[PDB]
Amino acid sequence: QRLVREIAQDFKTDLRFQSSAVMALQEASEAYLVGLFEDTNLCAIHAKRVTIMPKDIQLARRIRGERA
């Protein structure tokens, strides 16, 4: 809630939130992050390493196309 409050306050003055909105934002964040993490896991596996590394996430993003 602190992070979302800060980001919204940076984006727009004097905003308010619904509690349900903040909860939905948390749920969506967790879903996206778990998807990203599993993609990173598959990437690291392909590298033949168990230690996931930032490049694995970057690759996941590129193949997904969030930064291509």
Partner 1 sequence: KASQSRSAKAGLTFPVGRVHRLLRRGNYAQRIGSGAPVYLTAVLEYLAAEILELAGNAARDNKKTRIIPRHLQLAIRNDDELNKLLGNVTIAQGGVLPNIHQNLLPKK
Partner 2 sequence: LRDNIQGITKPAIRRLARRGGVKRISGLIYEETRGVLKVFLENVIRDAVTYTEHAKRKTVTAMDVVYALKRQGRTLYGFGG
Interactions with partner 2, residue window 27-56 (CB under 8 A): 27-34, 36-38, 40-41, 44, 49-54
Q: Does the footprint of DNA cover residue 13 (CB under 7 A)? A: no
Q: Does the footprint of partner 1 cover residue 33 (CB under 8 A)? A: no
d(CA 62, CA 32) in angstroms, rounded, equals 15
Which stretch in 9-17, 34-42, 54-62 sits in contact with partner 1 by CB under 8 A? 34-42
d(CA 33, CA 62) in angstroms, rounded, equals 16
Contact 16, 37 (CB under 8 A): no
Q: Does the footprint of DNA cover residue 12 (CB under 7 A)? A: no
Q: Does the footprint of DNA cover residue 2 (CB under 7 A)? A: yes
Helix, strand or coil, per DSSP, at residue 66: coil
